Amino acid sequence: SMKIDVVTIFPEYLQPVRQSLPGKAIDAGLVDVAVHDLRRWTHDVHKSVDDSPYGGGPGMVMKPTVWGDALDEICTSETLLVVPTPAGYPFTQETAWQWSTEDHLVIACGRYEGIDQRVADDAATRMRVREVSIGDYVLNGGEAAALVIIEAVLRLVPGVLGSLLEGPSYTRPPSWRGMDVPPVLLSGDHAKIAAWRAEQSRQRTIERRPDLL
Amino acid sequence: SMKIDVVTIFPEYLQPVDAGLVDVAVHDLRRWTKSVDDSPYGGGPGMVMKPTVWGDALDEICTSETLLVVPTPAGYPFTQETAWQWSTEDHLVIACGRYEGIDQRVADDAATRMRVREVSIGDYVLNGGEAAALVIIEAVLRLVPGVASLLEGPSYTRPPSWRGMDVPPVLLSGDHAKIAAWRAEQSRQRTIERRPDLLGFDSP
Ligand SMILES: O=C(OCc1ccccc1)c1cn[nH]c1
Ligand SMILES: O=C(OCc1ccccc1)c1cn[nH]c1
Ligand SMILES: O=C(OCc1ccccc1)c1cn[nH]c1
Numbered sequence A: 001s002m003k004i005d006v007v008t009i010f011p012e013y014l015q016p017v018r019q020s021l022p023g024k025a026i027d028a029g030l031v032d033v034a035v036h037d038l039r040r041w042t043h044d045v046h047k048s049v050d051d052s053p054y055g056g057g058p059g060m061v062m063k064p065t066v067w068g069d070a071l072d073e074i075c076t077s078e079t080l081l082v083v084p085t086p087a088g089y090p091f092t093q094e095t096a097w098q099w100s101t102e103d104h105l106v107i108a109c110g111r112y113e114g115i116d117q118r119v120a121d122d123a124a125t126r127m128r129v130r131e132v133s134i135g136d137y138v139l140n141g142g143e144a145a146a147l148v149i150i151e152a153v154l155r156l157v158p159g160v161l162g163s164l165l166e167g168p169s170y171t172r173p174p175s176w177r178g179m180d181v182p183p184v185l186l187s188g189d190h191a192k193i194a195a196w197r198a199e200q201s202r203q204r205t206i207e208r209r210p211d212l213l
Numbered sequence B: 001s002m003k004i005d006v007v008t009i010f011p012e013y014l015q016p017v018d019a020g021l022v023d024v025a026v027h028d029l030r031r032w033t034k035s036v037d038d039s040p041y042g043g044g045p046g047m048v049m050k051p052t053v054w055g056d057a058l059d060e061i062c063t064s065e066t067l068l069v070v071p072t073p074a075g076y077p078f079t080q081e082t083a084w085q086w087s088t089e090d091h092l093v094i095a096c097g098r099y100e101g102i103d104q105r106v107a108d109d110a111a112t113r114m115r116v117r118e119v120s121i122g123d124y125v126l127n128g129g130e131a132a133a134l135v136i137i138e139a140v141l142r143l144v145p146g147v148a149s150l151l152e153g154p155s156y157t158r159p160p161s162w163r164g165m166d167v168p169p170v171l172l173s174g175d176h177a178k179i180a181a182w183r184a185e186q187s188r189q190r191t192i193e194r195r196p197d198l199l200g201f202d203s204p
């Protein structure tokens, strides 16, 4: 079983992934995704979640007092606290695999500029904390990254959602708009098909991801 | 002004997207159909999306000026540089695949009349392109008129002391040159720790 809690100032953003869990995995008690409005933990009548950065400059920084209260309530010592940010360690398939066996993920969605560093630093003294990036680009907030993380992890959790690059794939029909499926794939020579696919993979990786070599 | 069209068999998942400087439309791929997928030629696990449905959908939605975007973990990397580039496009069409992918002939065909970009938003596997579409849309739209190479170091805000943890004193000093130097140092230190590849070093 896995419990996932997402904390965000835009709770409805996570509606698609909550309303995407098969009834079977929820009823088997194997997965539960809860979404929490960060403003639940604000202290002032204006429900402030951010403030100006120390040391100046434009941008806003999310308040440590608000986040601290939220995580105090939601997390336990067993929690894996995931903080998406473009400044994080890379989140990869290996990460997805590892987190797929966790009992409790809490995902703290920050907004542009980010969360006061003391929030993660404090949490790290009593739980495992992971600042991660899903890719080298900047979003306005962590919510899309949370969607990506939840999907990549949960699809590795048995029955929940239902090296080199992979080369091109083909299916019916055998001919379409003047383009034939490569005849080797229809040859019934499965050793040859494997070797063809390996070369396709090598060529595609060289062309698109030479870093992987 | 930009138009973004998203094509998907799960249009509900694209609810998280004024309009004004951009218009975003989401289209149900099934509006152009039996099934949308079948087993792969040459064998293997999973299903491949048939080219036929996609062809008709893209014929209606795309023009020769369209930038066709296809999220896939086998794509060229989508980075901040890509986002800057696409931020000046008139028309993005994002083809969301499911299962093992879309028949390659869809992209090959589209490429004879428009520019096509197969892209990865990162090295992991999703069940479908919808989440990636959301990521791309966000990354692009915040760069659109009227809205790297290092990791940013930590940020702080009030109070100056919290749970016995102080904001770095230099940030309270009002000395802009020292604040600038400290932040530059924190950025480089964080980058070498978390992303040594960005500074030209071997990954862990
Ligand atoms: O933009 C992202 O997260 C939102 C965020 C969080 C903190 C500060 C700025 C922006 C992101 C990019 N790759 N992975 C995550
Ligand atoms: O090309 C693929 O894998 C690329 C990959 C994935 C994860 C980490 C690194 C590289 C692929 C295509 N469909 N499914 C997987
Ligand atoms: O999983 C992704 O897209 C869905 C997809 C599309 C085609 C085949 C398999 C999976 C993706 C990962 N990084 N960038 C995109």
Ligand SMILES: O=C(OCc1ccccc1)c1cn[nH]c1
Pocket (backbone or CB within 6 Å): A086, A087, A112, A113, A114, A135, A136, A137, A138, B080, B148, B149, B150, B151, B152, B153
């Ligand atoms: O650390 C950051 O950017 C990292 C980044 C971005 C884009 C490509 C590579 C790396 C950041 C945090 N808040 N705003 C920006």
